[PDB]
Amino acid sequence: LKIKLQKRRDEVNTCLCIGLDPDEADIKSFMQSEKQNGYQSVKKNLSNSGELFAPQMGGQMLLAETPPKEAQEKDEFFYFFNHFCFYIINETKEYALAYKMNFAFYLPYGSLGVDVLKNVFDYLHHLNVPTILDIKMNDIGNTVKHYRKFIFDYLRSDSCTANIYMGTQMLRDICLDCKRYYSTFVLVKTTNADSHIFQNRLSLDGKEAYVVIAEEAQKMAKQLHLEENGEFVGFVVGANCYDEIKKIRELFPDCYILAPGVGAQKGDLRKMLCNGYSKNYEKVLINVGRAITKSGSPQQAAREYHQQIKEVLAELQ
């Protein structure tokens, strides 16, 4: 993955991570405008998926000459969920270092949305774009092995997010199969208003909780020999957490940071990118979800963020 991200970086010249978190309004509204416009976006998905992608879950109906009928409410919902996702990808992939799919959004409909999630990850695997499953997964080792099978065997994700409140020994079961190695990003500092209550107010020997968490995480990453095997344990540090992103880059010059919170949550892209800067700029993934997926034009949204990042990285070079 370290090589995969470096190669991708040099190809798209950005650290923009597109967040794909489709909610019911997004899907319903996309269906609505596709019905009205004669399925323009669907037709683009069918031609522009190059060699062309064949969805494994309901591939025939998704690739069909005519969409499902409205009487088939479930099928219709599945059809437009998949094509909404495919559309966001095709519109934005030229500007994307990675995509991060938040698991929560693919669950409210039962198995239906997991088949969609499978199709999304498979398509991105087909395109070879770096992938993140945002799951903030955590449990005891034996249970975590089963999360690993879902994330890394079934979805074939490049990485996921993980919550290490339980301890770092958990990393041994998510990041290794002895022979296969996988990357994860651990929650360090989060974007929500009250994140300071445990992440900053708790401490050990003068060091804030988030620092203790980062330090113990890298101690374990080294014990696991991930980096010798092309993989890493990175850090989720909120785009509005300017002090913490600075601190984390200071203490761990070569770490990989995943930074959500720009756009919908009003994080200061320039302030955060300056604070968390690495010349190896795939080491700050700036995640933007709703500011792209809910915009009038996701392509232009993506392009705008691509340009702003380009401009800030020029300032910093």
Ligand X SMILES: O=c1cnn([C@@H]2O[C@H](COP(=O)(O)O)[C@@H](O)[C@H]2O)c(=O)[nH]1
List contacts with its own copies (CB under 8 A): 21, 23, 57, 102, 104-105, 107-112, 114-115, 118, 134, 136-141, 143-144, 146-147, 149-150, 153-154, 163-170, 187, 190-199, 201-204, 209, 212-213, 216, 265
Candidates 102, 159, 168, 275; binder of ligand X (CB under 6 A) is 102
The option from its own copies, ligand X, none interacting with 199 (CB < 5 to 8 A, set by class) reads its own copies
- Using CB under 6 A as the binding criterion, the count of chain residues that bind ligand X stands at 21
Joined tokens for residue 312: 């800030």
241 CB neighbour count, 10 Å cutoff: 27
Q: Which of 42, 245 has the CB closer to ligand X?
A: 245
Smallest gap from Cβ 11 to its own copies, in A, equals 30
Q: For residues 240 and 267, give the distance between their C-alpha atoms in angstroms, rounded to a whole number.
A: 5
Cα separations in angstroms, 10 against 1, 95, 122:
14, 12, 23
Residues preceding chain discontinuities in the chain with C to N over 2.5 Å: 50, 177
For 156, the token pair is 């074939």
For ligand X, give the closer residue by CB, 220 or 236: 236
Which one-letter amino acid corresponds to residue 234?
G
Angle (CA) 197 202 204, round 5°: 165
Confirm if 134 and 101 have CB atoms less than 8 A apart. yes
Question: In this chain, which of 76, 139, 216, 304 binds ligand X, going by CB under 6 A?
Answer: 139
Q: In terms of Cα–Cα distance, which of 19, 66, 109, 3 is closest to 301?
A: 19
Residue 134 near ligand X by CB under 6 A: yes
Of 8 and 100, nearer to its own copies (C-beta) is 100
Ramachandran class of 2: left when φ > 0, alpha when ψ lies in -120 to 50, beta otherwise: alpha
Please list every residue from 160 through 199 that binds ligand X, using CB under 6 A: 190-191
Q: Which does 204 bind (CB under 5 to 8 A by kind): ligand X, its own copies, none?
A: its own copies
Residue 171 CB, shortest distance to its own copies, in Å, is 10
Q: Is 234 in the site for ligand X (CB under 6 A)?
A: no
List residues binding ligand X (CB under 6 A): 19, 21, 102, 134, 139-140, 143, 190-191, 236, 238, 260-261, 263-265, 287-291
